[PDB]
Symmetry: D2
Subunit: 308 residues, 4 copies
């Protein structure tokens, strides 16, 4: 049950013209190339390579009109000759600070349909995450995994290195209602707002006699978010004094993972509203991100409410 | 400059009989098999498989007399017919809690020469880490890496998946004198001793106007220790109220990484003495572990001194 | 320029509904699995495995109604629930006698559209090769190659083991007008007809002072035919006293390679008519096969004419 | 039961100083690199690359004094600083005419000990094949295989692409006493001597009512010789009018395969004496080669005797 076969079958079921199917295949081919490069990087700038692979694969798919990448200042408008209806926002390599120590790193993407009647522009990439058509990530960890949703839940696929294809390993994954792990960079504690300080105190010093949550923070958002999906708990990169609007990027970091987490029955908030409901105003806009098991995110939101 | 060629060349230089060379090759062959299994695990109990691979490879090398594994209650005495002079302590798969979320995991080992004149027994595995002949780890991360020392510094090798061999990527690596990352499970904060609480407070709320250290904690000791080696900083798993003697295991977790870190110019302490100077009293003995950049470990030791 | 991307792009250009595209992808996925098994066969009945992979991949593609395999006595009718419009004739593993000595082996296939209005049956697989929609082969040699035509010439793709995908290496390949290699099992010389004896004598003892042709015969038809395509010359498995109708099978050996060779500007004959014009009367029908560079096949046909 | 472990174990049993063991490992590492290059050649002069890999690997092993390669006019004398006792004759890539059509190709080698007391020179590479210390070949076919003998029979190993190591698949292989396949380029029939013409006639037109032998000729000597080993029969590249001393090269083609075939219980002759007994007079000397199942080679020798 390979990913390409799965994607083509889902396309058949959806009665699609093949356009999204070609796009997804092109994205996944880029991911396979990136995986191979990551697995031999030290022997063989990974941002630049990954970015080129994704842009070229996507543009040549005849399915795109606008791309937004972390690595490009401006939106990339597809040549008229190759122009299709989809807009792709992506982070070609997430976790760059973890490349050299061989920690898990990733690729993140969200796909939208152009709905405007205008000439294609950056504005077509400023849709709310609620309008996502498909989104997901690749995790280049101890094994290579893709999480993908096209709106009917989250499916996990793993690269079979012998076969050279991604194979379905879990269909329609659901996050636990409550976890026992909290994940954030506590090195920013001095800069936290009151709500974040209070929540973290609740995790480490519970007042109901429960065991403190365990702490984990890989420092690669895709790795920490994937763990949150499969083990439950909470991941936070809130606003702080040094990053008053948060650090993570709305279009190509936060919206894709918020989509996956919500699809799996979790929550993803800025602290004031769901990430997927934020209307983007600029392509490299930052937002706070708190996501994971719904009961844990709900508890964080109570801390925000109590301190507002 | 492949690992097997490198190991055989080092053997030639050492005027060895070939015994340690055969042992190291056998260990590294087990590591390659484990890597392959890890990279396809979700599709294809990893503790049990890895343990069997290592025991079989080591015993059949004709270089061992005693093995200690995390996965075996008692020391494993090699059959007389296959008996050599070396004692190997190993953790066949480190980071088991991180297997399912695809975070970096590893294999850890230390090799000793039997120095007693007695029949081989568990006592031959109770040498201080100072007596290590060779030690190191494999990290199954975004790429596969081996760190190895035979007493002349730390060398890093990376698996070339196309060639099917480990290749030298860095010779004689040295840790930074001081880093900017601290790494420990802060979920145990409620249970910390005063020295640990004070040190962590110093990292998050410096009193000299310096920037707080960043926090990272993968939760797989090999991954966190490897990051500490290549980026600098400090890794801690101190004793706490729930684990009054620490959690990590002296023979096959702490001594091997202490050896690597000291070889790279770092420090590794229990809080009261160097890990490598602890005389083991039992094969599955636990010890506290604080290691990394020497100035950072020295600062931790000042906190211990101040609170004793 | 990967095969999956290439096939999807050709589908887009053809304005296809995606049905043939899904079929081709499914076939090529089976080929990748077979390649992997072949490359580790001695360590790890290859007919049975390959056959199962192909049948399962094809049926689950929702693109087929009838399959004919060398390994199945009767045509395989696709379940109504999974039924599409295409008929696939295939040899899941060609060159079985060469498996154990590690010579090049292969997979061969031809795809037809069902044109009858009747319930699907073996009769839908009895079209002349002229009615082929797509055909080709995989060659599991020193590298893994696919030759594929959908009617616009022959394209060659090679498996990149690092990427895990087939990549285009040659577009629209054309056979040489005349070659210098002849390829047949001369162990059947005692049983040859007069025309074959005369032709072979002309190749070994030319009467115009030209150099004799070189002889090559791997004994795996896909390997010998592929060499004929890329180097030129002639390949023969004519009728003989022991095999009066030839040995090779019309539906899933001869028609697919005849299609590739004709598409590349060569000829493929039974000795009396083009292979592609033979009307099949039974699914496992045998025919004589003589193919390759047009001037060489034309010379063979002159020998047939002269001896009729 | 991996090749490196096997070679080191055989070294231990032989009480070797490790010198031959290091040499063999270096040769086998070159073979693994060549295999990888061959498997991706079309995408990625193969003679030149393979030659460089072998020379560099061998020289840096500290085990050699003299190398002879097909690709170098003169013997290559190892720098005094890296000088060991062994002489290696090799064909870094055998079957160059078959590279582009993806037929099986190979690497061939024979190892000798320097026995002279003189400064090392080409003369040290002019030993008779009887003096071989170790010899064998790699076959880059549908899978990758090494045949190796160090004087205690022929062992076959196959590359496990997942593990990245050669694994033992057959120990102490013996050729059949008589086969049913004959293998030679019959395109040279016009130039054959009387004995070769008579023998080939006996294979195609037996005079005792037996079935004619089947014909096979890949045209890559390593592939044809390997088939001869595992299936039995006979392989010939005799002298002919265009090549009065034969075509194949004594030092690095004929002696290595003659050694393997004799070790497996077969015969290898020039037509007048065993190949292994020929005293080489020049490093690129050619000899006729007829080898395989002993009863078949004996029959060929009767034809030589009858026509002398
Ligand atoms: N491969 C696929 N998987 C899931 N949904 C799809 C797929 N292809 C198309 N769809 C759905 O059908 C719509 C139209 O597809 P298309 O005609 O390819 O643009 C898309 O926007 C998706 O919502
Ligand atoms: N491959 C090697 N690399 C580094 N040191 C070695 C190697 N082989 C042997 N030695 C050193 O030489 C000693 C004796 O080797 P052996 O005779 O193989 O037990 C070992 O305990 C090591 O200290
Ligand atoms: N991927 C493709 N490559 C080449 N030709 C195609 C492809 N898909 C469809 N076609 C052509 O279009 C016809 C209809 O395609 P379909 O609607 O998928 O059955 C096929 O029978 C082919 O002749
Ligand atoms: N790995 C090995 N396998 C088989 N025979 C070996 C091996 N190593 C050494 N020998 C035999 O022992 C001799 C001396 O080995 P060395 O001291 O390494 O030159 C060689 O010439 C071989 O005949
Ligand atoms: O590491 P990142 O900024 O995608
Ligand atoms: O995960 P660990 O106990 O080696
Ligand atoms: O070897 P074959 O009968 O496909
Ligand atoms: O193809 P060859 O001359 O080794
Ligand atoms: Cl990680
Ligand atoms: Cl072949
Ligand atoms: Mg990035
Ligand atoms: Mg990122
Ligand atoms: Mg970045
Ligand atoms: Mg463990
Ligand atoms: Mg452990
Ligand atoms: Mg454990
Ligand atoms: Mg077959
Ligand atoms: Mg066949
Ligand atoms: Mg068959
Ligand atoms: Mg050659
Ligand atoms: Mg050759
Ligand atoms: Mg040559
Ligand atoms: Zn990013
Ligand atoms: Zn452990
Ligand atoms: Zn067949
Ligand atoms: Zn050669």
């Amino acid at each position: 049950l390979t990913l390409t076969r799965y994607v083509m079958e889902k396309g058949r079921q959806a009665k699609g013209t093949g356009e999204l199917t070609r796009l997804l295949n092109s994205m996944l081919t880029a991911i396979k190339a990136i995986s191979s490069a990551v697995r031999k990087a030290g022997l063989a700038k990974l941002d630049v390579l990954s970015n080129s692979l994704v842009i070229n694969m996507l543009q040549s798919s005849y399915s795109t009109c606008v791309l937004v990448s972390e690595e490009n200042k401006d939106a990339i408008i597809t040549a008229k000759e190759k122009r299709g209806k989809y807009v792709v926002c992506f982070d070609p390599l997430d976790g760059s600070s973890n490349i050299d120590c061989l920690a898990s790193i990733g690729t993140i993407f969200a796909i939208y349909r152009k709905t405007s009647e205008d000439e294609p522009s950056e504005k077509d990439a400023l849709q709310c995450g609620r309008n996502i058509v498909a989104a997901g990530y690749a995790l280049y960890g101890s094994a290579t995994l893709v999480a993908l949703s096209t709106g009917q839940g989250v499916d996990l696929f793993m690269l079979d290195p012998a076969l050279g294809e991604f194979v379905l390993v879990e269909k329609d994954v659901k996050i636990k209602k409550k976890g026992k792990i909290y994940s954030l960079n506590e090195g920013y504690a001095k800069y936290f707002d009151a709500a974040t300080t209070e929540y973290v105190q609740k995790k480490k010093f519970p007042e109901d006699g429960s065991a403190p949550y365990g702490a984990r923070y890989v420092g690669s958002m895709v790795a920490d978010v994937h763990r949150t999906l499969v083990y439950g708990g909470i991941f936070l990169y809130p606003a702080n004094q040094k990053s008053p609007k948060g650090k993570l990027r709305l279009l190509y970091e936060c919206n894709p993972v918020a989509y996956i987490i919500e699809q799996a029955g979790g929550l993803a908030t800025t602290g004031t509203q769901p990430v997927l409901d934020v209307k983007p105003e600029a392509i490299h806009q930052r937002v706070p991100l708190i996501l994971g098991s719904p009961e844990d995110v709900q508890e964080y939101l109570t801390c925000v409410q109590k301190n507002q």
